[PDB]
Amino acid sequence: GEIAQALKEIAKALKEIAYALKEIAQALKG
Amino acid sequence: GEIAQALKEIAKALKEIAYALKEIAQALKG
Amino acid sequence: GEIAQALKEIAKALKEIAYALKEIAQALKG
Amino acid sequence: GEIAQALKEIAKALKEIAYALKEIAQALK
Amino acid sequence: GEIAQALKEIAKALKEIAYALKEIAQALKG
């Protein structure tokens, strides 16, 4: 239902945030 | 009621997150 | 009740995350 | 019950993530 | 000093993201 859907989209968002932050970490090491 | 409202705000928040992340991705390319 | 409250705190959290990420996007464009 | 408890922990986690991200924004700003 | 700070906070952020995702995975089994 709608709570399961909310949570799936939050998991997606958090995975993209983790990747964004790793690319920012690498940029700053560069 | 309250749960429908909470879920509408979650959906709004996640749309802004998706937008922000695209601009972060682009910034890091240039 | 409890679920509505939990989801309202999640909605708040995600709104602050969207805000933070917009400032990160701006920083990186500088 | 169990779903309310799970969602309270998720709310806490996301609040700490929002704080972290604001400190990252400031560092970079 | 900004780079040191950024990298410390990104490491913290990633640990909290991994935790959030585990709790979301478990929640969705329920």
Side-chain angles (χ1 to χ4, degrees), chain A residues 1 3-30, chain B, chain C, chain D residues 1-28, chain E residues 1 3-11 13-30:
Chain A
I3 296 170
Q5 185 66 33
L7 289 172
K8 284 175 171 170
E9 295 181 18
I10 294 166
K12 179 189 194 309
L14 287 173
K15 285 180 212 167
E16 295 180 18
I17 291 165
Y19 200 81
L21 291 178
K22 287 178 185 181
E23 288 205 299
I24 294 171
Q26 179 67 23
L28 292 164
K29 283 141 143 207
Chain B
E2 213 148 308
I3 291 167
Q5 179 65 35
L7 289 171
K8 286 176 212 259
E9 295 315 315
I10 290 164
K12 282 183 197 145
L14 287 172
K15 165 179 297 206
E16 295 311 312
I17 289 166
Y19 190 97
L21 284 170
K22 289 174 44 169
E23 295 197 345
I24 291 169
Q26 181 57 23
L28 290 165
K29 295 184 198 165
Chain C
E2 207 174 2
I3 293 160
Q5 178 57 45
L7 289 172
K8 282 177 305 257
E9 298 175 26
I10 287 173
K12 282 181 246 163
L14 288 170
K15 285 183 218 205
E16 296 306 303
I17 290 171
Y19 156 64
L21 286 172
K22 288 175 192 175
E23 294 301 314
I24 292 171
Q26 175 53 35
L28 294 168
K29 281 166 207 137
Chain D
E2 74 289 313
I3 301 160
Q5 295 292 97
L7 291 173
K8 285 176 89 206
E9 188 65 45
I10 290 164
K12 182 178 282 184
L14 291 171
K15 283 181 218 173
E16 295 179 17
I17 291 161
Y19 177 73
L21 290 171
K22 289 177 186 172
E23 292 300 296
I24 293 161
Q26 288 175 90
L28 294 168
Chain E
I3 300 163
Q5 182 202 320
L7 291 171
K8 170 191 320 306
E9 297 300 349
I10 292 167
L14 290 169
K15 297 183 144 70
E16 297 177 2
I17 292 163
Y19 180 63
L21 285 170
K22 176 170 83 161
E23 291 301 309
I24 293 168
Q26 186 58 44
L28 290 164
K29 304 196 202 260

Short mmCIF file of all heavy atoms in Angstrom, two decimals, chain A residues 1-12, unseen atoms left out:
data_model
loop_
_atom_site.label_atom_id
_atom_site.label_comp_id
_atom_site.label_asym_id
_atom_site.label_seq_id
_atom_site.Cartn_x
_atom_site.Cartn_y
_atom_site.Cartn_z
N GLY A 1 0.84 -1.23 0.00
CA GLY A 1 0.00 0.00 0.00
C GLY A 1 0.86 1.26 0.00
O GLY A 1 2.05 1.20 -0.40
N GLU A 2 0.26 2.38 0.29
CA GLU A 2 0.87 3.73 0.15
C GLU A 2 2.08 3.87 1.08
O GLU A 2 3.02 4.59 0.70
CB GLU A 2 -0.18 4.81 0.40
CG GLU A 2 -1.22 4.94 -0.71
N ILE A 3 2.09 3.24 2.27
CA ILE A 3 3.27 3.37 3.17
C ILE A 3 4.44 2.59 2.57
O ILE A 3 5.56 3.13 2.49
CB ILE A 3 2.98 2.99 4.64
CG1 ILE A 3 1.95 3.96 5.21
CG2 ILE A 3 4.27 2.96 5.45
CD1 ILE A 3 1.37 3.59 6.56
N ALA A 4 4.20 1.36 2.11
CA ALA A 4 5.24 0.56 1.43
C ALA A 4 5.80 1.40 0.26
O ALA A 4 6.99 1.39 0.03
CB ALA A 4 4.65 -0.76 0.96
N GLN A 5 4.94 2.04 -0.52
CA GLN A 5 5.39 2.84 -1.70
C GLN A 5 6.25 4.01 -1.24
O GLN A 5 7.31 4.20 -1.80
CB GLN A 5 4.20 3.30 -2.53
CG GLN A 5 4.64 4.00 -3.80
CD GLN A 5 5.34 3.06 -4.76
OE1 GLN A 5 5.05 1.85 -4.87
NE2 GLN A 5 6.31 3.60 -5.47
N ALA A 6 5.82 4.75 -0.21
CA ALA A 6 6.58 5.86 0.34
C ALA A 6 7.98 5.35 0.71
O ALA A 6 8.99 5.97 0.38
N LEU A 7 8.04 4.22 1.42
CA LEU A 7 9.30 3.71 1.93
C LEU A 7 10.22 3.28 0.77
O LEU A 7 11.46 3.46 0.88
CB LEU A 7 9.03 2.51 2.85
CG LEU A 7 8.37 2.87 4.19
CD1 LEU A 7 7.96 1.62 4.92
CD2 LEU A 7 9.30 3.71 5.04
N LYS A 8 9.66 2.71 -0.28
CA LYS A 8 10.45 2.29 -1.45
C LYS A 8 11.06 3.52 -2.10
O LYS A 8 12.25 3.47 -2.50
CB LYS A 8 9.59 1.53 -2.48
CG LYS A 8 9.27 0.11 -2.09
CD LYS A 8 8.33 -0.60 -3.05
CE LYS A 8 8.24 -2.07 -2.71
NZ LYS A 8 7.15 -2.73 -3.48
N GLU A 9 10.28 4.59 -2.23
CA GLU A 9 10.82 5.82 -2.87
C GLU A 9 11.87 6.46 -1.96
O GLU A 9 12.83 7.05 -2.46
CB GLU A 9 9.67 6.75 -3.24
CG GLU A 9 8.76 6.17 -4.30
CD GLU A 9 7.61 7.05 -4.73
OE1 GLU A 9 7.66 8.28 -4.49
OE2 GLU A 9 6.68 6.52 -5.35
N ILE A 10 11.69 6.39 -0.65
CA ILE A 10 12.69 6.95 0.31
C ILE A 10 13.97 6.14 0.15
O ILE A 10 15.07 6.73 0.16
CB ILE A 10 12.17 6.97 1.74
CG1 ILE A 10 11.00 7.97 1.85
CG2 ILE A 10 13.31 7.29 2.72
CD1 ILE A 10 10.17 7.84 3.12
N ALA A 11 13.90 4.82 0.09
CA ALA A 11 15.10 3.98 -0.11
C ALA A 11 15.80 4.39 -1.41
O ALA A 11 17.04 4.50 -1.42
CB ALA A 11 14.75 2.52 -0.10
N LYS A 12 15.07 4.60 -2.48
CA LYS A 12 15.67 5.03 -3.77
C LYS A 12 16.44 6.34 -3.54
O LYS A 12 17.59 6.46 -3.96
CB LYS A 12 14.60 5.16 -4.85
CG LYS A 12 15.09 5.62 -6.21
CD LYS A 12 13.93 5.94 -7.16
CE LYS A 12 14.36 6.07 -8.60
NZ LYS A 12 15.50 7.01 -8.77
#
